[PDB]
mmCIF file of all heavy atoms in Angstrom:
data_model
loop_
_atom_site.group_PDB
_atom_site.id
_atom_site.type_symbol
_atom_site.label_atom_id
_atom_site.label_comp_id
_atom_site.label_asym_id
_atom_site.label_seq_id
_atom_site.Cartn_x
_atom_site.Cartn_y
_atom_site.Cartn_z
ATOM 1 N N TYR X 71 12.538 -2.255 3.689
ATOM 2 C CA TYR X 71 11.170 -1.729 3.783
ATOM 3 C C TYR X 71 10.147 -2.459 2.912
ATOM 4 O O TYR X 71 9.109 -2.763 3.371
ATOM 5 C CB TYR X 71 11.176 -0.218 3.440
ATOM 6 C CG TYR X 71 9.815 0.457 3.485
ATOM 7 C CD1 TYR X 71 9.260 0.853 4.682
ATOM 8 C CD2 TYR X 71 9.086 0.677 2.326
ATOM 9 C CE1 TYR X 71 8.010 1.442 4.733
ATOM 10 C CE2 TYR X 71 7.850 1.275 2.362
ATOM 11 C CZ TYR X 71 7.309 1.645 3.566
ATOM 12 O OH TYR X 71 6.106 2.267 3.607
ATOM 13 N N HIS X 72 10.453 -2.719 1.648
ATOM 14 C CA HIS X 72 9.495 -3.311 0.708
ATOM 15 C C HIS X 72 9.454 -4.819 0.781
ATOM 16 O O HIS X 72 9.795 -5.488 -0.171
ATOM 17 C CB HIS X 72 9.827 -2.870 -0.724
ATOM 18 C CG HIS X 72 9.574 -1.419 -0.980
ATOM 19 N ND1 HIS X 72 10.568 -0.463 -0.927
ATOM 20 C CD2 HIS X 72 8.432 -0.765 -1.308
ATOM 21 C CE1 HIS X 72 10.049 0.723 -1.210
ATOM 22 N NE2 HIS X 72 8.751 0.562 -1.453
ATOM 23 N N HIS X 76 5.364 -4.793 4.882
ATOM 24 C CA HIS X 76 4.853 -3.599 4.229
ATOM 25 C C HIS X 76 3.615 -3.906 3.385
ATOM 26 O O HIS X 76 2.670 -3.118 3.419
ATOM 27 C CB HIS X 76 5.900 -2.927 3.349
ATOM 28 C CG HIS X 76 5.340 -1.800 2.532
ATOM 29 N ND1 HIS X 76 5.017 -0.573 3.076
ATOM 30 C CD2 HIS X 76 4.991 -1.735 1.224
ATOM 31 C CE1 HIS X 76 4.520 0.203 2.129
ATOM 32 N NE2 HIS X 76 4.476 -0.482 1.001
ATOM 33 N N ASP X 113 3.607 -4.349 -4.309
ATOM 34 C CA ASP X 113 5.105 -4.219 -4.281
ATOM 35 C C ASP X 113 5.840 -5.577 -4.407
ATOM 36 O O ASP X 113 7.105 -5.711 -4.199
ATOM 37 C CB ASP X 113 5.612 -3.601 -2.996
ATOM 38 C CG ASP X 113 5.625 -2.115 -2.998
ATOM 39 O OD1 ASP X 113 5.633 -1.425 -4.068
ATOM 40 O OD2 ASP X 113 5.617 -1.528 -1.891
ATOM 41 N N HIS X 116 9.795 -6.631 -5.091
ATOM 42 C CA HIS X 116 10.483 -5.360 -5.117
ATOM 43 C C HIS X 116 11.979 -5.629 -4.886
ATOM 44 O O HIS X 116 12.290 -6.345 -3.970
ATOM 45 C CB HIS X 116 9.970 -4.475 -4.004
ATOM 46 C CG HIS X 116 10.140 -3.036 -4.267
ATOM 47 N ND1 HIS X 116 11.382 -2.460 -4.339
ATOM 48 C CD2 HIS X 116 9.245 -2.038 -4.432
ATOM 49 C CE1 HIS X 116 11.251 -1.168 -4.585
ATOM 50 N NE2 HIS X 116 9.972 -0.881 -4.637
ATOM 51 N N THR X 183 -0.013 3.350 -7.541
ATOM 52 C CA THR X 183 0.961 3.474 -6.466
ATOM 53 C C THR X 183 2.299 4.025 -6.960
ATOM 54 O O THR X 183 3.188 4.177 -6.167
ATOM 55 C CB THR X 183 1.208 2.174 -5.723
ATOM 56 O OG1 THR X 183 1.809 1.227 -6.601
ATOM 57 C CG2 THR X 183 -0.079 1.561 -5.255
ATOM 58 N N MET X 185 4.813 6.627 -7.521
ATOM 59 C CA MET X 185 4.929 7.959 -6.967
ATOM 60 C C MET X 185 5.028 9.077 -7.966
ATOM 61 O O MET X 185 4.652 10.169 -7.633
ATOM 62 C CB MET X 185 6.021 8.003 -5.909
ATOM 63 C CG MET X 185 5.436 7.471 -4.547
ATOM 64 S SD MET X 185 4.366 8.677 -3.705
ATOM 65 C CE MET X 185 5.257 10.111 -3.864
ATOM 66 N N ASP X 230 -0.719 3.171 1.042
ATOM 67 C CA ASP X 230 0.706 3.029 0.780
ATOM 68 C C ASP X 230 1.539 4.166 1.439
ATOM 69 O O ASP X 230 2.696 3.991 1.741
ATOM 70 C CB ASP X 230 0.920 3.004 -0.730
ATOM 71 C CG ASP X 230 2.312 2.551 -1.130
ATOM 72 O OD1 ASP X 230 2.901 1.547 -0.681
ATOM 73 O OD2 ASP X 230 2.893 3.219 -1.998
ATOM 74 N N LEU X 231 0.941 5.322 1.663
ATOM 75 C CA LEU X 231 1.609 6.396 2.403
ATOM 76 C C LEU X 231 0.981 6.607 3.796
ATOM 77 O O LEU X 231 0.898 7.741 4.239
ATOM 78 C CB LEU X 231 1.507 7.692 1.623
ATOM 79 C CG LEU X 231 2.118 7.616 0.239
ATOM 80 C CD1 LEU X 231 2.083 8.991 -0.376
ATOM 81 C CD2 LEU X 231 3.551 7.021 0.302
ATOM 82 N N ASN X 233 2.139 5.449 6.767
ATOM 83 C CA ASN X 233 3.133 5.302 7.835
ATOM 84 C C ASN X 233 3.223 6.439 8.851
ATOM 85 O O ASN X 233 3.303 6.175 10.037
ATOM 86 C CB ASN X 233 4.524 5.034 7.254
ATOM 87 C CG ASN X 233 4.680 3.643 6.657
ATOM 88 O OD1 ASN X 233 5.740 3.339 6.073
ATOM 89 N ND2 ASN X 233 3.642 2.801 6.757
ATOM 90 N N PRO X 234 3.281 7.697 8.410
ATOM 91 C CA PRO X 234 3.308 8.823 9.358
ATOM 92 C C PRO X 234 1.950 9.115 10.005
ATOM 93 O O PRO X 234 1.888 10.055 10.837
ATOM 94 C CB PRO X 234 3.750 10.006 8.492
ATOM 95 C CG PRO X 234 4.271 9.378 7.240
ATOM 96 C CD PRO X 234 3.409 8.180 7.019
ATOM 97 N N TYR X 241 5.387 4.367 13.405
ATOM 98 C CA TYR X 241 5.998 5.244 12.429
ATOM 99 C C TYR X 241 7.546 5.327 12.568
ATOM 100 O O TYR X 241 8.257 5.363 11.562
ATOM 101 C CB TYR X 241 5.339 6.615 12.542
ATOM 102 C CG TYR X 241 5.886 7.703 11.634
ATOM 103 C CD1 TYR X 241 6.347 7.418 10.354
ATOM 104 C CD2 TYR X 241 5.922 9.036 12.060
ATOM 105 C CE1 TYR X 241 6.827 8.408 9.541
ATOM 106 C CE2 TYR X 241 6.407 10.050 11.227
ATOM 107 C CZ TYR X 241 6.859 9.723 9.972
ATOM 108 O OH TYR X 241 7.336 10.695 9.112
ATOM 109 N N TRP X 244 8.962 2.218 10.926
ATOM 110 C CA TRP X 244 8.793 2.239 9.488
ATOM 111 C C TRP X 244 9.848 3.177 8.882
ATOM 112 O O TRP X 244 10.440 2.903 7.838
ATOM 113 C CB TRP X 244 7.414 2.778 9.141
ATOM 114 C CG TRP X 244 6.242 1.800 9.285
ATOM 115 C CD1 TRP X 244 5.058 2.040 9.910
ATOM 116 C CD2 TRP X 244 6.143 0.492 8.736
ATOM 117 N NE1 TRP X 244 4.234 0.951 9.804
ATOM 118 C CE2 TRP X 244 4.873 -0.019 9.088
ATOM 119 C CE3 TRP X 244 6.999 -0.313 7.972
ATOM 120 C CZ2 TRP X 244 4.438 -1.275 8.711
ATOM 121 C CZ3 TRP X 244 6.571 -1.588 7.616
ATOM 122 C CH2 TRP X 244 5.293 -2.048 7.981
ATOM 123 N N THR X 245 10.066 4.291 9.566
ATOM 124 C CA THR X 245 10.997 5.286 9.112
ATOM 125 C C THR X 245 12.388 4.690 9.105
ATOM 126 O O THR X 245 13.129 4.889 8.147
ATOM 127 C CB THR X 245 10.919 6.533 10.012
ATOM 128 O OG1 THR X 245 9.686 7.236 9.747
ATOM 129 C CG2 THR X 245 12.110 7.575 9.705
ATOM 130 N N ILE X 248 12.611 2.166 5.873
ATOM 131 C CA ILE X 248 12.642 2.858 4.592
ATOM 132 C C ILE X 248 13.965 3.602 4.411
ATOM 133 O O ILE X 248 14.594 3.508 3.364
ATOM 134 C CB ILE X 248 11.386 3.767 4.422
ATOM 135 C CG1 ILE X 248 11.323 4.349 3.006
ATOM 136 C CG2 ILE X 248 11.403 4.911 5.350
ATOM 137 C CD1 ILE X 248 10.293 3.731 2.051
ATOM 138 N N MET X 249 14.410 4.284 5.449
ATOM 139 C CA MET X 249 15.682 4.969 5.403
ATOM 140 C C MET X 249 16.874 4.007 5.266
ATOM 141 O O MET X 249 17.948 4.387 4.774
ATOM 142 C CB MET X 249 15.840 5.823 6.660
ATOM 143 C CG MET X 249 15.099 7.165 6.645
ATOM 144 S SD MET X 249 14.989 7.927 5.051
ATOM 145 C CE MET X 249 16.618 8.982 5.109
ATOM 146 N N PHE X 252 16.719 3.228 1.441
ATOM 147 C CA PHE X 252 17.196 4.384 0.676
ATOM 148 C C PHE X 252 18.705 4.547 0.783
ATOM 149 O O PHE X 252 19.347 4.811 -0.215
ATOM 150 C CB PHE X 252 16.506 5.683 1.116
ATOM 151 C CG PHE X 252 15.065 5.825 0.667
ATOM 152 C CD1 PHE X 252 14.408 4.829 -0.051
ATOM 153 C CD2 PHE X 252 14.349 6.983 0.980
ATOM 154 C CE1 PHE X 252 13.046 4.983 -0.425
ATOM 155 C CE2 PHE X 252 13.007 7.143 0.601
ATOM 156 C CZ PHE X 252 12.364 6.155 -0.101
ATOM 157 N N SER X 267 21.285 10.975 -4.879
ATOM 158 C CA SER X 267 20.190 11.874 -4.561
ATOM 159 C C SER X 267 20.346 12.365 -3.088
ATOM 160 O O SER X 267 20.540 11.548 -2.188
ATOM 161 C CB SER X 267 18.906 11.098 -4.756
ATOM 162 O OG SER X 267 19.218 9.873 -5.404
ATOM 163 N N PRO X 268 20.295 13.675 -2.848
ATOM 164 C CA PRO X 268 20.441 14.263 -1.498
ATOM 165 C C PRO X 268 19.858 13.565 -0.247
ATOM 166 O O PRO X 268 20.228 14.015 0.853
ATOM 167 C CB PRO X 268 19.773 15.635 -1.665
ATOM 168 C CG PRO X 268 20.175 16.047 -3.077
ATOM 169 C CD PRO X 268 20.159 14.731 -3.874
ATOM 170 N N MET X 269 18.984 12.567 -0.401
ATOM 171 C CA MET X 269 18.353 11.862 0.719
ATOM 172 C C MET X 269 18.738 10.404 0.924
ATOM 173 O O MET X 269 18.426 9.827 1.965
ATOM 174 C CB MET X 269 16.860 11.809 0.496
ATOM 175 C CG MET X 269 16.203 13.112 0.694
ATOM 176 S SD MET X 269 14.455 12.879 0.459
ATOM 177 C CE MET X 269 14.075 10.925 0.544
ATOM 178 N N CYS X 270 19.304 9.789 -0.101
ATOM 179 C CA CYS X 270 19.803 8.443 -0.007
ATOM 180 C C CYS X 270 21.281 8.524 0.412
ATOM 181 O O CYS X 270 21.955 7.505 0.526
ATOM 182 C CB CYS X 270 19.657 7.759 -1.368
ATOM 183 S SG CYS X 270 17.982 7.751 -2.120
ATOM 184 N N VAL X 277 17.738 12.327 8.493
ATOM 185 C CA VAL X 277 16.508 11.496 8.479
ATOM 186 C C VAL X 277 15.330 12.351 8.949
ATOM 187 O O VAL X 277 14.327 12.485 8.283
ATOM 188 C CB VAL X 277 16.616 10.292 9.427
ATOM 189 C CG1 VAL X 277 15.321 9.360 9.328
ATOM 190 C CG2 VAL X 277 17.906 9.537 9.149
ATOM 191 N N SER X 280 14.175 15.029 6.512
ATOM 192 C CA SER X 280 13.597 14.443 5.317
ATOM 193 C C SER X 280 12.196 13.879 5.575
ATOM 194 O O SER X 280 11.383 13.850 4.666
ATOM 195 C CB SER X 280 14.549 13.411 4.696
ATOM 196 O OG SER X 280 14.708 12.264 5.526
ATOM 197 N N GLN X 281 11.926 13.420 6.806
ATOM 198 C CA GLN X 281 10.589 12.993 7.232
ATOM 199 C C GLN X 281 9.690 14.238 7.295
ATOM 200 O O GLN X 281 8.568 14.203 6.836
ATOM 201 C CB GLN X 281 10.632 12.365 8.630
ATOM 202 C CG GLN X 281 10.462 10.844 8.741
ATOM 203 C CD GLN X 281 9.954 10.173 7.469
ATOM 204 O OE1 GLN X 281 8.788 10.296 7.130
ATOM 205 N NE2 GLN X 281 10.829 9.459 6.781
ATOM 206 N N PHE X 284 8.916 15.250 3.840
ATOM 207 C CA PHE X 284 8.080 14.234 3.233
ATOM 208 C C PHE X 284 6.623 14.495 3.622
ATOM 209 O O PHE X 284 5.765 14.555 2.770
ATOM 210 C CB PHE X 284 8.530 12.855 3.695
ATOM 211 C CG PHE X 284 7.762 11.749 3.106
ATOM 212 C CD1 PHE X 284 7.564 11.677 1.750
ATOM 213 C CD2 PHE X 284 7.235 10.761 3.911
ATOM 214 C CE1 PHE X 284 6.838 10.644 1.211
ATOM 215 C CE2 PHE X 284 6.510 9.727 3.380
ATOM 216 C CZ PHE X 284 6.321 9.663 2.031
ATOM 217 N N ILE X 288 4.201 16.135 0.800
ATOM 218 C CA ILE X 288 3.505 15.012 0.162
ATOM 219 C C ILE X 288 2.425 14.275 0.938
ATOM 220 O O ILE X 288 1.339 14.056 0.394
ATOM 221 C CB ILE X 288 4.521 13.955 -0.322
ATOM 222 C CG1 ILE X 288 5.308 14.511 -1.509
ATOM 223 C CG2 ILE X 288 3.799 12.604 -0.663
ATOM 224 C CD1 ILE X 288 6.176 13.486 -2.184
HETATM 225 C C1 VDN D 401 13.065 10.271 3.901
HETATM 226 C C2 VDN D 401 12.162 9.057 3.808
HETATM 227 C C3 VDN D 401 10.763 9.558 3.567
HETATM 228 C C4 VDN D 401 9.745 8.477 3.760
HETATM 229 N N1 VDN D 401 9.287 7.933 4.935
HETATM 230 C C5 VDN D 401 8.319 7.009 4.668
HETATM 231 C C6 VDN D 401 7.606 6.190 5.712
HETATM 232 C C7 VDN D 401 8.183 6.994 3.263
HETATM 233 C C8 VDN D 401 7.262 6.181 2.414
HETATM 234 O O1 VDN D 401 6.510 5.394 2.950
HETATM 235 N N2 VDN D 401 7.361 6.341 1.084
HETATM 236 C C9 VDN D 401 8.209 7.425 0.532
HETATM 237 C C10 VDN D 401 8.612 7.442 -0.897
HETATM 238 C C11 VDN D 401 8.916 8.740 -1.318
HETATM 239 C C12 VDN D 401 9.254 9.040 -2.627
HETATM 240 S S1 VDN D 401 9.647 10.566 -2.944
HETATM 241 O O2 VDN D 401 8.668 11.208 -3.814
HETATM 242 O O3 VDN D 401 9.737 11.279 -1.683
HETATM 243 N N3 VDN D 401 11.071 10.551 -3.517
HETATM 244 C C13 VDN D 401 12.027 9.645 -2.847
HETATM 245 C C14 VDN D 401 13.418 10.250 -2.947
HETATM 246 N N4 VDN D 401 13.649 10.455 -4.371
HETATM 247 C C15 VDN D 401 15.052 10.439 -4.804
HETATM 248 C C16 VDN D 401 15.809 11.597 -4.170
HETATM 249 C C17 VDN D 401 12.725 11.361 -5.067
HETATM 250 C C18 VDN D 401 11.291 10.842 -4.932
HETATM 251 C C19 VDN D 401 9.293 7.990 -3.552
HETATM 252 C C20 VDN D 401 8.957 6.680 -3.145
HETATM 253 C C21 VDN D 401 8.608 6.397 -1.813
HETATM 254 O O4 VDN D 401 8.264 5.129 -1.450
HETATM 255 C C22 VDN D 401 6.901 4.817 -1.775
HETATM 256 C C23 VDN D 401 6.797 3.476 -2.477
HETATM 257 N N5 VDN D 401 9.164 8.089 1.433
HETATM 258 N N6 VDN D 401 9.044 7.888 2.808
#
Side-chain angles (χ1 to χ4, degrees):
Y71 179 80
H72 291 98
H76 173 74
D113 274 339
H116 205 293
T183 65
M185 278 284 316
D230 193 48
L231 301 186
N233 288 175
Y241 177 35
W244 281 132
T245 288
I248 187 105
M249 280 327 270
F252 286 2
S267 350
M269 287 182 16
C270 305
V277 184
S280 67
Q281 253 347 286
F284 181 50
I288 290 189

